[PDB]
Design a protein around this ligand. Structure first.
Ligand code: 7YF
Length: 246
């Protein structure tokens, strides 16, 4: 996250921190995710494309920090790693960039809600809020696009939904953005999601309820003018989600 603020897991209790085990024993951060039900976390396919082995991953919930332990955190393994069959990408844009991970503890249990862990609601089919709406994004991603390191503390910021007709503009993304994606950006372009934030939530208030409207996918650079954040559009994937979580 560029700009925005530091926060704790309690302010985003659905955020899932996803790491990969490295052969030879080292573990590194891969991507964020969101807890949509007790046993299921939703994220972005491109996070996992180069290493599709479910055994390679660990999912933490209730975790406020990247490389140090948060009290109340719960650790899981991936029982099922579902990547979207229609995933494709360019140098820039990613399509059908959505994934599910089914989590189970070694003890065999799905997540249990607490102070630090809550599920997030899915939207209703094809139901997104109007352009102009302020949503929030959360991640362990770079604080600036040139950084070598990720912050150690979780961050969030606020961005406003942009129009497709508008994200369509040549100055913006043109052809690259489809109806399976949503765009969001700061009006002055000062805050945005950056590498490391992918898989993470775009959360908007829809019908008096915090709702998972998007998944962090791609953008050109991080917080660059005329180049908004692009997000997988959850409301247009419910059938995929329901089918694959049945
Ligand atoms: N919101 C913005 N601006 N970017 C979100 C970046 C999320 C990131 C997470 O892993 N996604 C990607 O890196 C996917 N690939 C990219 O964003 C490509 C496109 C330009 C570039 O610099 N790298």
């Amino acid at each position: 996250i560029i700009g925005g603020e530091f926060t704790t897991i309690e302010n985003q209790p659905w955020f899932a921190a996803i790491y990969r085990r490295h052969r030879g024993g080292s573990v590194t951060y891969v991507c964020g995710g969101s807890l949509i039900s007790p046993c299921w976390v939703i994220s972005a396919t491109h996070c996992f494309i180069d290493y599709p082995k479910k055994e390679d991953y660990i999912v933490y919930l209730g975790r406020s920090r990247l490389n140090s332990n948060t009290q109340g955190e719960m650790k899981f393994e991936v029982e099922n790693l579902i990547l979207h069959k229609d995933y494709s990408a360019d140098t820039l844009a990613h399509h059908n960039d959505i994934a599910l991970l089914k989590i189970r503890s070694k003890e065999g249990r799905c997540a249990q809600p607490s102070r630090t862990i809550q599920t997030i609601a899915l939207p209703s089919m094809y139901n997104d809020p109007q352009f102009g709406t302020s949503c929030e994004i959360t991640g362990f991603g770079k604080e600036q696009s040139t950084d070598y390191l990720y912050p150690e503390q979780l961050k969030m910021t606020v961005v406003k939904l942009i129009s497709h007709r508008e994200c369509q503009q040549p100055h913006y993304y043109g052809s690259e953005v489809t109806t399976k994606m949503l765009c969001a950006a700061d009006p002055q372009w000062k805050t945005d999601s950056c590498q490391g934030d992918s898989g993470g939530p775009l959360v908007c208030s829809l019908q008096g309820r915090m709702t998972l409207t998007g998944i962090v996918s791609w953008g050109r650079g991080c917080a660059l003018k005329d180049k908004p954040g692009v997000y997988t559009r959850v409301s247009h994937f419910l059938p995929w989600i329901r089918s694959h979580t049945k």
